[PDB]
Every structure is written in structure tokens, then in C-alpha cells.
Amino acid sequence: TLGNTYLTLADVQKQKDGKGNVTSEIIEMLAETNPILEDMVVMECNDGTGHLTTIRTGLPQATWRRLYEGVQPAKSTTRQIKDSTGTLEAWSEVDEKLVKLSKDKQQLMLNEAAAFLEGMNQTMASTLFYGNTATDAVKFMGLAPRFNAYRAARNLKPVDTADQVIDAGGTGSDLTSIWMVVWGDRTAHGLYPEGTSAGLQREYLGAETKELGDGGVYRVVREKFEWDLGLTVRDFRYVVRIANIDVSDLQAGTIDIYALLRKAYYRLENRVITGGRAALYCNADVTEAMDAAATPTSSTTASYVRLTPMQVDGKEVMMYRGIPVRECDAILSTETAVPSVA
Amino acid sequence: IDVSDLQAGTIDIYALLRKAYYRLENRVITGGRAALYCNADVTEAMDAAATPTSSTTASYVRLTPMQVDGKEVMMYRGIPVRECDAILSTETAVPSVA
Amino acid sequence: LVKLSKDKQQLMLNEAAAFLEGMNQTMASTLFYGNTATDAVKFMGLAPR
Amino acid sequence: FNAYRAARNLKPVDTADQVIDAGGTGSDLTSIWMVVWGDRTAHGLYPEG
Amino acid sequence: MIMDKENTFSYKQAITGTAVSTNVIDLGVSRDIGKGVPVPIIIQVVEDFADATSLTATLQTSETENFSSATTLATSGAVPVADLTAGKQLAVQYMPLGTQRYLRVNYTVSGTATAGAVTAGVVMSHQQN
Amino acid sequence: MIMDKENTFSYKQAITGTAVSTNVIDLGVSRDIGKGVPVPIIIQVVEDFADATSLTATLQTSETENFSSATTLATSGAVPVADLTAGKQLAVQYMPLGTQRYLRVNYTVSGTATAGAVTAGVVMSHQQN
Amino acid sequence: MIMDKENTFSYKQAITGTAVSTNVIDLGVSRDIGKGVPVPIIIQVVEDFADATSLTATLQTSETENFSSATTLATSGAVPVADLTAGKQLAVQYMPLGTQRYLRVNYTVSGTATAGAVTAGVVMSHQQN
């Protein structure tokens, strides 16, 4: 059965022009843009078991000393958390005659390499935004698994991460989220283990000699594609996400974006002091709606913004509150409910 | 100040801030140095009323493009606003007097 | 124990910073609710008046 | 493009996923266009020779 | 011909009874591969048929591993056994249009057969005369 | 988080009953792996449990391939079906002392569990929340 | 090795009968020691034992001062009497996970021993033969 595993002959026929030469210009039509992996800071773990974060969980609150009293000495407690890196790689397996009869090798390698690069980038962004290693044991913890719980009330100071998520009333499979990460030496950053290298590493293995279980030695060619990284959210005061954003709304005038964004901005307890570069990543539905509520035309019972000629259409959504708004396609408009912590 | 109803905008803040500034009848005859303190909820609502997007139920602040962002609040007619986390968000309700 | 930390200064600085923060938090929070009526060992605050 | 996705899905870009409809259903209908005129966008093929 | 292993429906399969193909070519994405540059296919009968009567040779396509509901893209009709010799093609030259998700070949036979085989599958270039 | 194939006592292993581990590890000479620099281990539970009552996470070791003679090194008690969710470790983060020759994991359950999975095995770098 | 008298669950405590360790630690808040740098401890038998059948050194924990709630974090199993000699570590060489405010170390023995002493607490290093 199958027919989907290796690069069959039909695909090679499809990847060439009518003149009989392999196509140099391939329409992707499935590439995505994800600058999270571009603006992210990453450095080698360069340590033992893993990257280490030290969190304080106790204060030596002073005592109202009466005169002739012995104040009991106090200690400051600390809590430690470590985060690990993850590794994935993908391989290309093609018959050598599949190459030779295509009259062109380097072109076929270029096409397959570009496709593999795009695939890995998309996969990596998807796992960064959703690394639910709770049920994986690989695919290092991303961002959604850490904040996949919100607390409705009592969200005064960041006692847990359930105070870093804002309900928006959504329901159904049309929910989404907005992340506002801060990349910095202490805020949060990417991570790769020592000895390896940053970014995607690709290796051309040349002609192989694929040996079959039942005595078969047909000759194949392979390319290596390797890229590993890990995350470390040192502070849950540096990441705030909005849950239950129902896309049945947000296209009509039912949920105001800037209301939730300001609510979250003030939930970001560590923008009062510069820790590092900030960002607010969206899914291009949020940005569409944001330009729909920042340059309003015939909007529904709202939008105190008052327009002028030459400014009736809209300009851009580049910066939220000085935070650059980088548009990341990895985010999905289906995320399932993030529940309310009781 | 009911934070649950402070987020909804039902309780005005700039009106009651005007009342309090008026209630403090001394600084307009000089004195020392004044300062205003507010928990995250109070300042947040004041920044909201400063730059409304869907505060709804009427408002008279009008914004232009490139201005819907919302700048942080810094003064109240010359009274620096200081972010004092000491003010809690659950305390006694100063029961009805007289 | 301080000598075994191999620094003897960073640990002490950490503990001092924690103690400073604790003290500042305590009087800052009792600067606004330090009711002698509820506990007659601390100076009168701003709310009880 | 003479078919629009009624309940649009976010980015499964299909020919029916690039048409926005609003009203019409009469005899006053018309459309607006957005064509990118570039080499690997869209262009005019004159037959070989 | 340089017909290869993977995208091949059946290799010398007897289908003497009323059987179906074995290697169901499955594609995760509905490419509908026939468009544009063609792809040659064969359902050429590879060894003669003895006592069959009809060999309806559908090219059923469906949307599930098991063809719960299938769609026909090429049917040879009730070809009488008098023509089921070697080289008797049973469908069009190149790939048809409409290959939605999955592809398996049916071999409805009127009555049973004591001999018969086929080599249906994709070919790089046809062989003619 | 980095893991291996050999240094892996289980991989989403079903515990639908009083099952035991699958990939029993060997170490050549008997040796003691708990000595010296610590070696991590993850007994994280995957595929949240449904109907169990207690999951015994014994960490039996032996000197023979068949665990005729076993030496308990750690345990987690009768952890209820409640909790036992994803990301729930159930033993010591590192390898305890007394690793005779081989190692395996026991999964005694007081009843029947209609779901549940484990990923017992050595991990290059433990993942702390 | 260094011993940290402040964290010392027992110091040459006698093990006749079943009871709990002398010192019940209190880490201020509900912090978990387990996650982070490996904090080493040794529940090691310091003096040999007697006719008692078996020992079951356990590491209970609870948020409350008194351990009205039983939450096991580790267990030595049912260690035999024959191997219960001096310098034999009994339980997890490092902190398990889930350490709540208070940590006791239960000493359940099958019957009663006419001898036997055990020390338990954090250290700065080990011996490991």
C-alpha cells in the first residue's frame, strides 16, 4: 500500500517542466512566516543537568520588637527550577536512479532541501508555542503548557501562572491566544545543549547503499537536517497570554482587543523595569481585527477613534505599546478551552 | 472601590479623583509635596479612561490613529502618581456612617 | 557555613537583600493599615484614622 | 475564483479561501480585484515563438 | 519500461476470483495528480485468462483506508475473456482526474477463473509497438 | 528533553493491569550506577489514567536476566487513580544505590486501569517545571 | 562528611519498634527541594540490627506540622535484616519530588529489634565506598 514514504516517480514527474528539466521555481503555497525563531535569543546551556533558575519563595518578615524582647532570627528560602533542551531531525531518502533519470541532481536536492527547511521551521514554531511535554517526554516544554490554566479572581500578584492568563469568554473549537514574551538574559530565552551548534544544521551524506532486511542493496542518496533547541521561562511575570478568544466573535464587534491587551499589559508585572527585548506575537487574525478596531469605518456601536481623510483606511499594526508586534503563523485558531482554576 | 466593577467601568475614577482633589482643600494654598497612590486595578482603570477603546456607555475622549496604544499615566494635574503595592484589593468597607 | 560557600559575600548579599525587602514590605503594608487598635505595637497608619 | 468559503478557515489557502462575500444576490453585483503583477506571482504568457 | 515498486497497484496478481488489488496507493493530500504534466499508467493484463467471463476493472478511489465509499475514475467494462490475453490494456493511457484520497483497483469478475494475472501500476513511459 | 532507546525502561507502555516494564537494561559487569555523579531518570506518566486504584512504582533490580531474584530500590506507594495525570513523576529523580546487574520497573495495580502510560527511563537532562 | 545538624531527621536514633524519626523538618513554605540542584541525604544504618524480621524505612511528607495526612515520597521497600549492617544506605540518595512544608522519616520494622541505629539528614557530599 502506502506510496507516501519515499520520493516516488510520480512526484519527480510532477517536479519538472514540459521541456524535461527539473523545475527551479516551485510555488510553495504552504510556507509560513514565524519570526519567533528569528528574534529569539538563544545561548548554550553550558552547565550540568540543565539550565538553572532560582526562585525565591520566602521572605524574612521582620518582627515588631517590644523593648526587652528577643527577636528570633529568620532565613530567606529559595526554590530552584531547571529546564531542558530538545532535539529533532528529519531525513530524505531517494533512489539514485530517480536522480539520474531526472537529468539534474543539484536541482532536486535544492527543491527537497528547501521543502525540508520550511517543514522543520513550521514544526519548531508549532512546538515552541505548544510543547506539551506532559504527554510526550520529548518536545521540550513550550509556552502554552506552562500557562494552560487561568485563575478568575485573586489575580493580584503572580502567586502562580494561573494569574498570567486572562479569560475572554470563548467557547468551542474557535479559540486562540496572544503571547507577549520578553527575550533577555534573565527574562527568558532559547537554549541549546553544549557541543552542538545554533540554528539548523544540514549535512549532505552523498550516495548511500540502503540495505534491505531481505537481501536488497539498492542505492539511495540522503541529506541530513538537524536542529535542536530548548526553552527557559525563568519568570512567569514576563509572559502573559489571553485564553478563550472565540473567533465567532473578534470578527464582529463583541470582544474588544485593546481592552484585553491593556488588561494583559498591566498583568505583565515586569515591564516596569527593562529586562530585555519584548514582543507580542499574534496569528494574523488578531492583527486583522486589531486594524479593524483601530481605524474604524462603520464599526458597531464603538470605536471612539475619530478619523480624517487620507487616514480612513488604516496604516499598520506594527507596535502595540512600544512592544513590536511580530506576526507568527504557528499559532492556531483552534486551541481547546483553557479551564478556570477553582 | 469595587475592582470587579472597576474593570467594567461602572464606577467612574476621574470623577471621584476630581472629587478627592477637591476634597483635599489645602494644596491650592501651597504646602509640602503631594503624591497619589494606587493599586494595579486603580491605575489600570485610569489608563483605560484616559484612552478608551470600548469603555462603552459614553465617553468624551477622542483618539486619532497611532494613538489607540494607551500611554501610562504620570500625573494628575501636577501630582505624580506612584504605584504603591501596599494598597490591597480586599479590606473593610468603612461601614455606613451617620 | 558561610566559608564553605566559596564566596562568603554573594550569599551574604543575597540574604541581606531578602531581609531589606521583607522589612520594606512590612512597614509599607503597615504604613496603610497599621492600626494600634488591632495590634498595639506598631505606629498608627493612614487607614485607621 | 467563482466560489467563496462560507465559514472561512484561517490558513488552508484554497481558491475558495480567497473570496470574501457580502450581500449581492441581486442584479447589481460586482467585484474588486487584487493581483500581484510579478514573475512568480502572475504574468502574461505569450506562446513560445 | 522502468516501472517501479512503490506506486504499483499489483504485481502479477492472479485475481482469478472476484478479488481486489493489494497495494492500495494512499496519499495523505488530495493532489489529484493527473493535472499538468501527465503520468503514464497501465492495467495491462500480464498472463492469459482461462475460464472467466468478464473482468470489470474499476479504478475505485475513496477517502478512507477501507473504501467505505469509493469513486470510479476508469472502468474497462465487461471485457469478455476472448481478449484477456497478454498486453490487453484495461483503461486510459495517462493518469485520470479525480483521485481524491485513496486508490485501489477492483476486479469484479462474472464467475470465477482458473487463470489470469495483471500488473496494474504507474509507469514512467508507455511501451507501444 | 533528551532520551535514549536502550536506557529506557518503557515508552508510553500500557499498564492496563499489573504489568511490568519491557526494556530491561544490562550494564555488562555488575557495577553500581548510583555511585559517583548522579544519573537522572524520569518515570513521568502519559495518557492520564482512568479507572485504576493504586500504582506501585517499584524499581526492581536483579543479577539475572530473568528477575527470579529482585532487589527493590525505590517505590511510590499506593498513589491513587486521582492525580496520576500527565507529567506526574513517581520515583526518585536519580538512580538509587544498589544497581546489581539489571534494572526494570514494576507496575503493581490494585485493580484494572482502562488507560495510562509511563515513560520510565534515563533522561540526559531532567525537566523541572 | 558535613552533616547540617539543623536538617538531621535522626542522629544515632534507636530503631526498636515502629515510630517516626525525631526531627520533623520545616522549610518555611511549601517549596519543593527536589526540583533544582540535587540535595543529597543519607538514611543510612549506623549500627547493626537484631532478630527483627525486616525494616521499611519510609519518607512521609505533609504540609501540616503534624502528619495527619500521609503522602509518601520514597520507600526502602521491605529491606531484610541480614543485610542491615553499618553504612548501608536504605532509601533515596537524593530528594524525591513533592516535598511539602514538613518531612518526617518513618521507621516501620517487622516486629521489634533489640539493637539498630539510623541517622538521616542532608549532607554536603558522600562516601560511596
Where do the domains of chain E lie? Answer: 1-129
* Shortest Cα distance, chain A CAs vs residue G37, angstroms: 7
Chain B positions touching A262 (Cβ under 8 A) are 44, 47-48, 70
Q: Experimental technique used? A: cryo-EM
**Rounded-to-integer distance, Cα B51 and Cα B69, Å:** 8
Rg (CA), chain F: 14
Question: Which residue on chain A is closest to E36 by alpha carbon?
Answer: A14
The closest CB to that of C22, out of A60, A64, A66, belongs to A60
Look at A27 and D40 and tell me if their CB atoms are within 8 Å. Answer: yes
Return d(Cα F28, Cα A36) in angstroms, integer: 46
C-beta atoms of C47 and B86 within 8 A:
no
CA nearest to F14, candidates F59, F52, F58, F71: F52
Query: Hey, what's the cell of E77?
Result: 467494462
What's the gap in Å between the CA of C7 and the closest CA on chain B?
34
- Closest to A9 (Cβ–Cβ): which among E4, E23, E37? E4
Residue A30 one-letter amino acid: L
The residue in chain D having the minimum alpha-carbon distance to the alpha carbon of residue A176 is D10
Which residues from chain G sit within 8 angstroms of residue F72, using beta carbons?
76-79
What are the sequence ranges of the domains in chain A? 1-342
Q: What is the DSSP string of A60-98?
A: -------TT--PPP----EEEEEE-EEEEEEEEEEEHHH
* Joined grid coordinates for residue E16: 482469478
DSSP annotation of G107: E
G26 in contact with chain A, both atoms CB, cutoff 8 A: no
Mutate to test the interface with A, among B3, B43, B53 (most CBs of A within 10 A): B53
The answer to whether A200 touches A224, Cβ cutoff 8 Å, is no
| Count of alpha carbons within 13 angstroms of residue G55, beta-carbon side | 35
Q: Do A13 and E124 touch (CB under 8 A)?
A: yes
**Residue A93 · residue A205 · CB < 8 Å:** no
Alpha carbon distance G53, A65 (integer Å): 55
Closest CA to G74 of G102, G44, G104: G104
Q: Extract the C-alpha cell encoding A342.
A: 477553582
Distances (CA, A) of A129 to A31, E62, F25, F88, F98: 18, 35, 35, 22, 41
Helix (H, G, I), strand (E, B) or coil at A121: helix
E strand intervals along B31-76: 36-38
Using the beta-carbon criterion (under 8 Å), do A157 and B85 form an inter-chain contact?
yes
CA dihedral A268, A269, A275, A278 (to 10 degrees): 10
Interchain contact A174–D (C-beta under 8 A): no
Per the CB < 8 Å rule, is E37 touching A16?
yes
Which chain C residues are Cβ-neighbours of B87 within 8 angstroms? 32
Chain centroid, CA E14 distance in Å: 13
Alpha-carbon distance D13 to F125, whole Å? 40
A320/B43 touch (CB, cutoff 8 Å), yes or no: no
Contacts of C46 in chain B (CB under 8 A): none
Q: Nearest Cβ partner of G29 from A49, A52, A77? A: A77
CA distance B36 to B41: 14
H or E element at residue A122? helix A106-129
Taking the Cβ of residue C46 and every Cβ of chain A, the question of whether any pair is shorter than 8 Å is answered with: no
| Nearest-by-CA chain F residue for A49 | F125
According to DSSP, the residues that pair with D4 across neighbouring strands are none
Which of the other chains make 3 or more beta carbon contacts under 8 angstroms with chain E? A
Q: What angle do CA A285, A287, A293 make, to 5 degrees?
A: 105
G121 to chain A, minimum CA–CA distance in Å? Answer: 18
Q: Which of B63, B69, B71 has the CB atom closest to A304's CB atom? A: B63
Closest listed residue to residue F107, CA positions, set F97, F116, F94, F99: F116
**Residues in chain D closer than 8 A to A283 (CB atoms):** 10
Task: Name the B residues in 1-40 with CB < 8 Å from any C CB.
Answer: none
Q: How far is CA B20 from CA B13, B15, B47, C1, E76, in A?
A: 10, 9, 18, 55, 92
Rounded distance, CA C16 to CA A114, Å?
56
Q: Which residue among C18, C26, C41 places its CB closest to the CB of A56?
A: C18
Is A82 near chain G, with CB under 8 Å? yes
Contact E40, E125 (CB under 8 A): yes
Pairing of the two strands A340-341 and A150-151: parallel
Nearest Cα to Cα of residue A195 among A29, A36, A18, A47: A47
Given resolution (angstroms) = 3.5
Taking CB atoms and an 8 Å cut-off, how many pairs form between chains A and B? 67
What is the DSSP code string of A208-275? ----BTTTB---EEEEEEEEEEEEEE--TTS-EEEE---TTSSSSTTS-HHHHHHHHHHH-TTSSS--
Using CA atoms in the order D3, A171, A254, B12, what is the torsion angle rounded to 10 degrees? -170
Pair F91, F57: CB distance under 8 Å: yes
Measured between CA atoms, the residue of chain C closest to residue A56 is: C18
CB atoms within 10 A of CB A107: 18
Contact by Cβ (8 Å): A18, E37: yes
A1-14 per-residue burial string, b: 16 or more CB within 10 A, e: under 16: eebeebbbbbbbbe
Of B86, B88, B91, the CB nearest to C31: B86
Chain A residue with minimal CA distance to D10?
A333
**What is the C-alpha to C-alpha distance for residues A44 and A228, in angstroms, rounded to an integer?**
11
CA distance B85 to chain C (A): 8
Give dist(CA A235, CA A275) in Å, integer.
11
Contact at CB, A10 and E37, closer than 8 angstroms: no
The residue to which cell 527483627 is assigned? G52
**Residue B22 contacts by C-beta under 8 Å, 6 or more apart in sequence?**
none
Quote the minimal CA–CA distance from A112 to chain D in Å: 19
For residue D7, give the C-alpha cell.
Answer: 465559514
